[PDB]
């Protein structure tokens, strides 16, 4: 017969290959479409999820009850050090697929990028790129490279740039830097390749790529949760207590008549560690990193126009299971995918974003920097010492 009381289905078939992701770094599946009216720029960036805190800001939306009020919202800190450009790649357009035509690396390539090409850096003799770097100080090699760039002027349609993260400034345990192709969308192919050759062997910060109050896309791998049951993974209804052979299970698989179990039947398996791409994430603030001038360093990154305090965005006791953020960072509305220390791909928006909630200008009031490692109740060290007084150890 039929189902008596109809119900919506548990889970989505658009995400059904729930396997462990083969890639660890979040890959861009689709870059934004180019147009020659816009100038040349990067369309993606590769940051690292640091932590979470509050935010305090004014709401400017007409008609709401929440208009001109001081709300709090969850934000993600993503530490985004400036990446090093160490190569380019062109793409020819074929009726079979968008094929990579010719990849051209740089002359001086740092050891951070050298770590990626090796599975075992200790036993290796560190002899990569040695016969390739001899093409940059001879007569014939420069001619062959100029012929390669001149062929890329003619036949390449899509030009992606090769940039790797700067891992030495990061507080992570690993030293192997992540590499990434970023599609440069801008003017003509010749101006695009000239700008990429100008930006070769250069630093790329985040102020050049993104800006304030921009809706961006976050690509990354889900926090892994291991082999889980169907109640934990697909969130099905639990069977009652009186069941003999288990209750946190799926009772009926299917009918007698498709002598198989269908793909849509919710089974038990891998929960977490899945590649995901979430859209419409709002940047509240791109904070400056630590910099030293006139002797003492300037670290007031959590300072707003209304706070005027010398505290940084690093909370009391640092970020939990991440370390301390010394580099320049971005701060996003809501939560992003992934655990701590997770590599996290930023991307510009695919959709032409013109909405009232999306075109809102954000003026920050207070950035919460209390200790997230437990119930924190102080914002900074001098405020804590002024409230506590002299201690026994002091």
């Amino acid at each position: 017969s039929h189902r008596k009381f109809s119900a919506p289905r548990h889970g989505s078939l658009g995400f059904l290959p729930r396997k462990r992701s083969s890639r660890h770094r979040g890959k861009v599946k689709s870059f934004p479409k180019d147009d020659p009216s816009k100038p040349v720029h990067l369309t993606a960036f590769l940051g690292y999820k640091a932590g979470m805190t509050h935010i305090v800001r004014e709401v400017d939306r007409p008609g709401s009850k929440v208009n001109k009020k001081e709300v709090v919202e969850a934000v993600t800190i993503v530490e985004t050090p400036p990446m090093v450009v160490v190569g380019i790649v062109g793409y020819v357009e074929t009726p079979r697929g968008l094929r990579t035509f010719k990849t051209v690396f740089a002359e001086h390539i740092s050891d951070e990028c050298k770590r990626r090409f090796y599975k075992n850096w200790h036993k290796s003799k560190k002899k990569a790129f040695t016969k390739y770097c001899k093409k940059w100080q001879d007569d014939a090699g420069k001619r062959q490279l100029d012929k390669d760039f001149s062929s890329m002027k003619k036949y390449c349609q899509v030009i992606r740039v090769l940039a790797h993260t700067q891992m030495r400034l990061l507080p992570l345990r690993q030293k192997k830097a992540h590499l990434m192709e970023i599609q440069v969308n801008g003017g003509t192919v010749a101006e695009k390749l000239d700008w990429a050759r100008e930006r070769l062997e250069q630093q790329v910060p985040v102020s050049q790529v993104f800006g304030q109050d921009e809706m961006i896309d976050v690509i990354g791998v889900t926090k892994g949760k291991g082999y889980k049951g169907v109640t934990s993974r697909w969130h099905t209804k639990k069977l009652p207590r009186k069941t003999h052979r288990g209750l946190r299970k799926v009772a009926c698989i299917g009918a007698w008549h498709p002598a198989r179990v269908a793909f849509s039947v919710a089974r038990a398996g891998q929960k977490g560690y899945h590649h995901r791409t979430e859209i419409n994430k709002k940047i509240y603030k791109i904070g400056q990193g630590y910099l030293i001038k006139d002797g003492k360093l300037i670290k007031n990154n959590a300072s707003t126009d209304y706070d005027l305090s010398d505290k940084s965005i690093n909370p009391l006791g640092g970020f939990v299971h991440y370390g301390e953020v010394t580099n320049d960072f971005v701060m996003l509305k809501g939560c992003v995918v992934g655990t701590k220390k997770r590599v996290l791909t930023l991307r510009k928006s695919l959709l032409v974003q013109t909405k009232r909630r999306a075109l809102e200008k954000i003026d920050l009031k207070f950035i919460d920097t209390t200790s997230k490692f437990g119930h924190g109740r102080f914002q900074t060290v001098e405020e804590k010492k002024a409230f506590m007084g002299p201690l026994k150890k002091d």
């Binding site: 509050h54 305090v56 001081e70 709090v72 009031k365 207070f366 919460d368 209390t370 119930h375 109740r377 914002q379 409230f387």
Partner: protein, 61 residues
């Protein structure tokens, strides 16, 4: 922003934190954490418990 003090402890509650509790007679109280919440619901004296601000104001520390 209005930094309201805790009713049990007297600590400076920030707008991201706290759990506010209103009784039937009125007198809306603010609490920093569930420690102070459980102490108020079990009706403990803040002047008798050592780590509060009222203990320090009473015993001149």
């Amino acid at each position: 922003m209005k930094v309201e003090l805790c009713s049990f402890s007297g600590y400076k509650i920030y707008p991201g934190h706290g759990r506010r509790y209103a009784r039937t007679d009125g007198k809306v109280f603010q609490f920093l954490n569930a420690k102070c919440e459980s102490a108020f619901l079990s009706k403990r004296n803040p002047r008798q418990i050592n780590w509060t601000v009222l203990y320090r104001r009473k015993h001149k520390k």
